[PDB]
Design a protein around this ligand. Structure first.
Ligand SMILES: Nc1ncnc2c1ncn2[C@@]12C[C@H](O)[C@@H](COP(=O)(O)OP(=O)(O)OP(=O)(O)O)[C@@H]1C2
Ligand SMILES: [Ca+2]
Ligand SMILES: [Ca+2]
Ligand SMILES: [Ca+2]
Ligand SMILES: [Ca+2]
Ligand SMILES: [Ca+2]
Length: 341
DNA sequence: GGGGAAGGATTCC
DNA sequence: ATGGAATCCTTCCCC
């Protein structure tokens, strides 16, 4: 089994450059403005320029401006990046019938049957780099290995504009030499949990009682890490089927008043329903981020599919339930549909 | 013991 | 100190 994984590079920033070559060689920052005040909000992606100087996703815009007050600041245009993504996604279907589109900027293929060894795989990776660059002038990063996991890692090693195979020789090395928090699916929380069990490498999960591991990180997380460690992770490249759809917006000022939050919830419903795209949900959820950024949700499932007037009048009832069952204020409010037909 | 729901929570990008 | 969706975990009723 051979997996080729593609991560487009610095994607929203990169698309903004193609539409406007003037931003070649300039630091570029793409953001989501709150409208809470002047420049309020966060960064979503920056290009390599702005990025090597500290500017990264997740950070407040004003902070990003204290670092590079002379870099370019762009309001994001999700629609645009989306379209470009699809076109590039299509370009990939030439190379395999076996494709997994993971996200707007990421996909896997299963080239096991098009390439004889890892050598032809590399060339293939170069054929696809050449192609996207020819058609859309977009640079991507290719990461080849023998499972979805090491493919992604290979790609994270060579990022950006790079390419990188990880043969079984290097896989075997990485299981005992790679920092365990560079494993996909291991964010800071799980990392500190793993540090406190002395597991700082993928193999260290082979010399610990399962029960003890299952105690710190749970059953499912355990199995996962052990499977890579014994080198038997075989998750097949299957097509993704959207399981849920929603929108969530940041309120200009924080509030507990039902009337003030009401319009935001309603906007979020209008976007979510339009995104549904001839799909009918049985399950609705109202999701709220509190003044201290704790997530609080209330939901409900229906034996039939949800109509938009029902969605309106049930979300008001769930939002009520939140303000009754919690005393914090709210800064973000949204809905999420799921359990389709 | 586990499936289905409802809520929390993590990590993904 | 923004937005998207997927997976799991914990707790509950129910078989
Ligand atoms: N914190 C974030 N908020 C919103 N979007 C985010 C956040 N972190 C990552 N993202 C992205 C940004 C890009 O669209 C996509 C990630 O690719 P990038 O262009 O940032 O480059 P990369 O270094 O992550 O590979 C993903 C949703
Ligand atoms: Ca990227
Ligand atoms: Ca990580
Ligand atoms: Ca909570
Ligand atoms: Ca109360
Ligand atoms: Ca990425």
């Amino acid at each position: 089994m051979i997996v080729l994984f593609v991560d487009f590079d610095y994607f929203y920033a990169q698309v903004e450059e193609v539409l406007n070559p003037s931003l070649k060689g300039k630091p570029v920052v793409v953001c989501v403005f709150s409208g809470r005040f002047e420049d309020s909000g966060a960064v979503a992606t920056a290009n390599y320029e702005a990025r090597k100087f500290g500017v990264k996703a997740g950070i407040p815009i004003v902070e990003a401006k204290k670092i590079l007050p002379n870099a370019v600041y762009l309001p994001m245009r999700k629609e645009v990046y989306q379209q470009v993504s699809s076109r590039i996604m299509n370009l990939l279907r030439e190379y395999s019938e076996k494709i997994e589109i993971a996200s707007i900027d990421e996909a896997y293929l299963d080239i096991s049957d098009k390439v004889r060894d890892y050598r032809e795989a590399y060339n293939l990776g170069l054929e696809i780099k050449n192609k996207i660059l020819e058609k859309e002038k977009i640079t991507v990063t290719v990461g080849i290995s023998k499972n979805k996991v090491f493919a992604k890692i290979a790609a994270d090693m060579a990022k950006p504009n790079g390419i990188k195979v990880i043969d079984d020789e290097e896989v075997k090395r990485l299981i005992r030499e790679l920092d365990i928090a560079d494993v996909p699916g291991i964010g800071n929380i799980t990392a500190e949990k793993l540090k406190k069990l002395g597991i700082n490498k993928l193999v260290d999960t082979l010399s610990i009682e399962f029960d003890k591991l299952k105690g710190m990180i749970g059953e499912a997380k355990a199995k996962y890490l052990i499977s890579l460690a014994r080198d038997e992770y075989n998750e097949p490249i299957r097509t993704r089927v959207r399981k849920s759809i929603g929108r969530i917006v940041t309120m200009k000022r924080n509030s507990r008043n039902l009337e003030e939050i009401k319009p935001y919830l309603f906007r979020a419903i209008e976007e979510s329903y339009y995104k549904l795209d001839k799909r009918i949900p049985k399950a609705i959820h109202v999701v709220a981020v509190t003044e201290d950024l704790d997530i609080v949700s209330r939901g409900r499932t229906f034996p039939h599919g949800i109509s938009k007037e029902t969605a309106y009048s049930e979300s008001v009832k769930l939002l009520q339930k939140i303000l009754e069952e919690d005393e914090r204020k709210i800064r973000r409010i949204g809905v999420r549909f799921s359990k389709f037909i």
